[PDB]
Amino acid sequence: MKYMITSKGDEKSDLLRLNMIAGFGEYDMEYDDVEPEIVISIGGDGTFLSAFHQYEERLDEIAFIGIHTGHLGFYADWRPAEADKLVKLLAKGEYQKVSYPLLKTTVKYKKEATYLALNESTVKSSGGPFVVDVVINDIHFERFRGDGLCMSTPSGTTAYNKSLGGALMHPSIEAMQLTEMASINNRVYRTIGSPLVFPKHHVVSLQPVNDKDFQISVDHLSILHRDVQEIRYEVSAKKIHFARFRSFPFWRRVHDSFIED
Amino acid sequence: MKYMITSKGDEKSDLLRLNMIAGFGEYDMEYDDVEPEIVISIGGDGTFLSAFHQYEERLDEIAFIGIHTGHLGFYADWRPAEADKLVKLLAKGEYQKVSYPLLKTTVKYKKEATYLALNESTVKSSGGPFVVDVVINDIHFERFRGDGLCMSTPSGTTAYNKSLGGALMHPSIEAMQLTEMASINNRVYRTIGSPLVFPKHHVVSLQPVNDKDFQISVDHLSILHRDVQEIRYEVSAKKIHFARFRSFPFWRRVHDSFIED
Amino acid sequence: MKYMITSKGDEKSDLLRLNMIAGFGEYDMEYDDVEPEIVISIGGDGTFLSAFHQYEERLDEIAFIGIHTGHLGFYADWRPAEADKLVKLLAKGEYQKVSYPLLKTTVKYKKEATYLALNESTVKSSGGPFVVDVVINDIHFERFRGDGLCMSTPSGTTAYNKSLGGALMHPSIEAMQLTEMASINNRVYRTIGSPLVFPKHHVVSLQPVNDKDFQISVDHLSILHRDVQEIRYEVSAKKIHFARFRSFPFWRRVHDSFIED
Amino acid sequence: MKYMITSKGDEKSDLLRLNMIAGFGEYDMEYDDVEPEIVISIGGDGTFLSAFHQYEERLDEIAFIGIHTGHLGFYADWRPAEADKLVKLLAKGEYQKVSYPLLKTTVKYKKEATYLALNESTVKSSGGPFVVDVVINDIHFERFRGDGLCMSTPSGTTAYNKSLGGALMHPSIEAMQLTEMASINNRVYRTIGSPLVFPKHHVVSLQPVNDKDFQISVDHLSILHRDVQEIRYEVSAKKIHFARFRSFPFWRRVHDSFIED
Ligand SMILES: Nc1ncnc2c1nc(Br)n2[C@H]1CCCCO1
Ligand SMILES: Nc1ncnc2c1nc(Br)n2[C@H]1CCCCO1
Ligand SMILES: Nc1ncnc2c1nc(Br)n2[C@H]1CCCCO1
Numbered sequence A, B, C, D: 001m002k003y004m005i006t007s008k009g010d011e012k013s014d015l016l017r018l019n020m021i022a023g024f025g026e027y028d029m030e031y032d033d034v035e036p037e038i039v040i041s042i043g044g045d046g047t048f049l050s051a052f053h054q055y056e057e058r059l060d061e062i063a064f065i066g067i068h069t070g071h072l073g074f075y076a077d078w079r080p081a082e083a084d085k086l087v088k089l090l091a092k093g094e095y096q097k098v099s100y101p102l103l104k105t106t107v108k109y110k111k112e113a114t115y116l117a118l119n120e121s122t123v124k125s126s127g128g129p130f131v132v133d134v135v136i137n138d139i140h141f142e143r144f145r146g147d148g149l150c151m152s153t154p155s156g157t158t159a160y161n162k163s164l165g166g167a168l169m170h171p172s173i174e175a176m177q178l179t180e181m182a183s184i185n186n187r188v189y190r191t192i193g194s195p196l197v198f199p200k201h202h203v204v205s206l207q208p209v210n211d212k213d214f215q216i217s218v219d220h221l222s223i224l225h226r227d228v229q230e231i232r233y234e235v236s237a238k239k240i241h242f243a244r245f246r247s248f249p250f251w252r253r254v255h256d257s258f259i260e261d
């Protein structure tokens, strides 16, 4: 079938990349970076992130695999030494597939823009103070004054979400999580402080009070958006499909990354 | 049908309790506190908690209603002024039902004990230091040294869970959440620090290292358990069934309780 | 003696400003905004901040007073209704003086720049990742990877410092406090996590690892600094001198601002 | 001069204890555990704690030394391998002394009891809910509802204080710090949340609202106190005197204990 391979650019990953292509020629595997059915990234979670944010118009037709040339990753959870056995089982077939939830981000102003995020989407101010009204399913929930907000996917709870005091969520739970950044609370302003986890179909909307320019990030990407009228956070209908062979539990992957490997 | 009414004991709740029974006689409603199909509690979330921890052997045959004589509650979310309209719609029928997830707690030693918790179950030490090994689905995750741990239901995230830095979870998500208490971290010990959210079927087990006596709480109840070999936390198969009429979203109930009513 | 008055620019503060000048003509008080011995700001803590960051070359020759036309402030702790009694006691003399500690900030590259901060000084990255080595009195303490760091004066603990989980410090304690921003911790990186309070003469130095451009703030001011070789945080030798009449304890000022006024 | 040596009881510390006494006979050093001028503890910070809480009626007449047979300690900051050089420099004289601040704890009811704490003093409830009014210098500051409170000395910030989110304080700062335990905040109750650092002479008083029984700890010691009318926290006039030779900065001791040794 059709496949392609992403690389981190260094000498370690490119050499490991060419050794899978050479072994791929021994099987019935055609190389195609325009219409691959298997995306394989080699490097780190950042390399996997880019490989995702490149074929995100056909997420329901690709099974991704991630290999970590450096430390262990949460998406690149395959050691380089197990590359040969990967190609053998990858080129055969009849592997199990795994899907993780995603986060739709809608921006309304000059039309309206839409984004998919594997990790999280964060919102800050253009330079001055960050003030937004937080509407949850058409209901004004709070008025947030601080550095910004961050809505995270389940598999993205281990990333920026974790730095902000949020909870680590098992990615089999179709949900999204909102976390606060240096929220100022006093006799005047009042934020919930706690992280909030929203199920499917739950819509969280951010609306400006004064400044209508917000520096918005979608995973690694980050753009300053001008004349913003609304931001829509919502669990996406699309899911990223993983290819799996051996079992690597998310909780074990959490153990190795933070406790001890 | 059969019903019963719990009261907080004060003069406000007992008077409000007798006014529903008197109006109940105007309809086809038999009073029965042994086999009720409708449990109505009057007082606070604590009064609702006791009413739950009393008919918890027939949770799949009762629809609970909670009225708050004081401030708003997360389970007692009906004002006393709306009691008359409750009895009218309660005694008719054809109301919508709502189910919330629960948390099974297994204690192994002298047999083995099992508990259902509407809010949370917490574990502390008998007096000395609290040290436990944390096993997640047969896999040793961490060794916790601190004051204790707390596993919370979704609707219980607003209670003790919230005090420990955990996230607020929408109760339509069948999951449980673990939070840490004053975890000491150094060059030696290492806890995850973050809260952990486990889906259905996920089993979290606590195992002792030295002290085998743990002061364990199940909602309001709290007992010192001697010679403990294991504690099993797990999302319960049973759900508590609520009776609903008007819509009171959990997020609005969170807004009124902490931001402003 | 010589005095001047700062105003917030709105109609409320300018009217209140002219009423003190008119009453000042009834006493022996000369208006002078070049060499005042008494600086009076009218508006909020932001207005007081600007009045400080304007006469900061003669801090040991001025006693500041702050009036709050809006809500109570931590430096503007005088109600507008008590303006007349202020001018009477201000124009007499024989008032008590009060000094608060300050934070010296040294930036080394194109010479070397020095800054005084009444509240705090914060450091972020120019755009990419924020990585710095933290040296405490010539000793490498930690390598910080996150959003940035914030060193706060005692009276500035109530401001950004408080948003980052830091402690509130009584301003009679000559010390400075460092707080972390969304510090990422894993098997690799390791930050202390806790806030650190340094006494007088203690020198905290930040040194770059890769990126040598840091967006640095000094109270309200904020500049991107290029080709930075070192940042020096240190309790300043200069103190801001306050004029006092009635006693307004910092702890009461903390109570009114966050608990209830 | 007169000295005595405390030991942890295990075989490693007692052997190391007898080797200093044997070498002590080679100099002019008399052994005396009733009136020692030098207290030497061997084991851990817990062993040092007990050695402090034993001669605390003559703190201004003793210089303590701590040796760690296990991991490094914050008071037992001398490796066992450097024991011989200790006895030589200890038995000579003309060493530098170092004093750390202490925390006075007054309990009023049956008289009134007073306690000195090297690390911290904590207060919990007798079993039910913990509710206290917090008075700061005769001024009601807040009403705390939660698990308890903890007032820490500067050198005790590294201990329980650190587990509760408090700041690490350099022990040259004569101050005390208060931290909260699982404080519940809602539309009703309101705690400051932040840790509070009080200078010398500042008096913090806890007063009961309903329950007058509080489980109170003073370092390792912990007693349930009945019919309590007030608890008084206050920086003590007495200081613990350390004997020093080489310089071991508190910040380096913090680095080795939590970052990496
Ligand atoms: N989901 C994730 N969990 C933990 N880390 C993640 C992550 N996704 C990415 Br990209 N990362 C990495 C990128 C480089 C190092 C920092 O975070
Ligand atoms: N789920 C919940 N969320 C918030 N509060 C809850 C709660 N359950 C109970 Br009981 N409570 C109340 C009891 C009395 C006041 C403290 O908490
Ligand atoms: N020290 C301080 N403590 C609390 N607030 C402070 C402050 N200094 C300033 Br400026 N502020 C205000 C400015 C406007 C509102 C936000 O913070």
Ligand SMILES: Nc1ncnc2c1nc(Br)n2[C@H]1CCCCO1
Residues within 6 Å of the ligand: D044, D045, D046, D049, D074, D119, D155, D156, D157, D158, D159
């Ligand atoms: N001041 C302190 N800082 C850090 N640890 C301290 C401490 N005092 C004591 Br005792 N300890 C130890 C005792 C055994 C291990 C836990 O804490």
